[PDB]
From Swiss-Prot:
Record EC number: 3.2.1.17
Disulfide pairings: 6-127, 30-115, 64-80, 76-94
Expression across tissues: In the egg white and polymorphonuclear leukocytes.
Organism: Gallus gallus (Chicken)
Protein's name in the database: Lysozyme C
Catalysis: reaction(s): Hydrolysis of (1->4)-beta-linkages between N-acetylmuramic acid and N-acetyl-D-glucosamine residues in a peptidoglycan and between N-acetyl-D-glucosamine residues in chitodextrins
Residues annotated as catalytic: 35, 52
PROSITE patterns per record: GLYCOSYL_HYDROL_F22_1, GLYCOSYL_HYDROL_F22_2
Purpose: Lysozymes have primarily a bacteriolytic function; those in tissues and body fluids are associated with the monocyte-macrophage system and enhance the activity of immunoagents. Has bacteriolytic activity against M.luteus.
InterPro entries attached to this UniProt entry: Glyco_hydro_22, Glyco_hydro_22_CS, Glyco_hydro_22_lys, Lysozyme-like_dom_sf
């Protein structure tokens, strides 16, 4: 599923991301835009052979099981395919564990490089939330 900007903002708000660990909704929408272009089915293979999955490009080296990442962990206790669903619940619940993990949103390289220090509130401007 490819979300609309405001649709995703509404979905992330209903799932508790709004100011989660102090990150305003626009931060998460900005991260989704640059990680996946709001496409739940986005995958990207890493040089180390891990794979990123879903709207927030969550990686198989730590967070989910794809059965092809030797010596990896499954800290969110989910099959990586769950992160590709039109239901963002698995993506949001796993994101809450990642963002709690000491580095906050710096864990998403595209958030640090493209959203941090920008006017992220622009990403939710004109949405009914
Ligand atoms: Cl957009
Ligand atoms: Cl915001
Ligand atoms: Cl594995
Ligand atoms: Cl594990
Ligand atoms: Cl599994
Ligand atoms: Cl949803
Ligand atoms: Cl933080
Ligand atoms: Na894994």
């Amino acid at each position: 599923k490819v979300f609309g900007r405001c649709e995703l903002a509404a979905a992330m708000k209903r799932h508790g991301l709004d100011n989660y660990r102090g990150y305003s909704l626009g931060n998460w929408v900005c991260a989704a835009k640059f990680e996946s272009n709001f496409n739940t089915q986005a995958t990207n293979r890493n040089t180390d052979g891990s794979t990123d999955y879903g709207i927030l490009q969550i990686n198989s080296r730590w967070w989910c099981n794809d059965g092809r990442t030797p010596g990896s962990r499954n800290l969110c206790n989910i099959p990586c395919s769950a992160l590709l669903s039109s239901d963002i619940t698995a993506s949001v619940n796993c994101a809450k564990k990642i963002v709690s993990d000491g580095n906050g949103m710096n864990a998403w390289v595209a958030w640090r490089n493209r959203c941090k220090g920008t006017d992220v509130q622009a990403w939710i401007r004109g949405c009914r939330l």
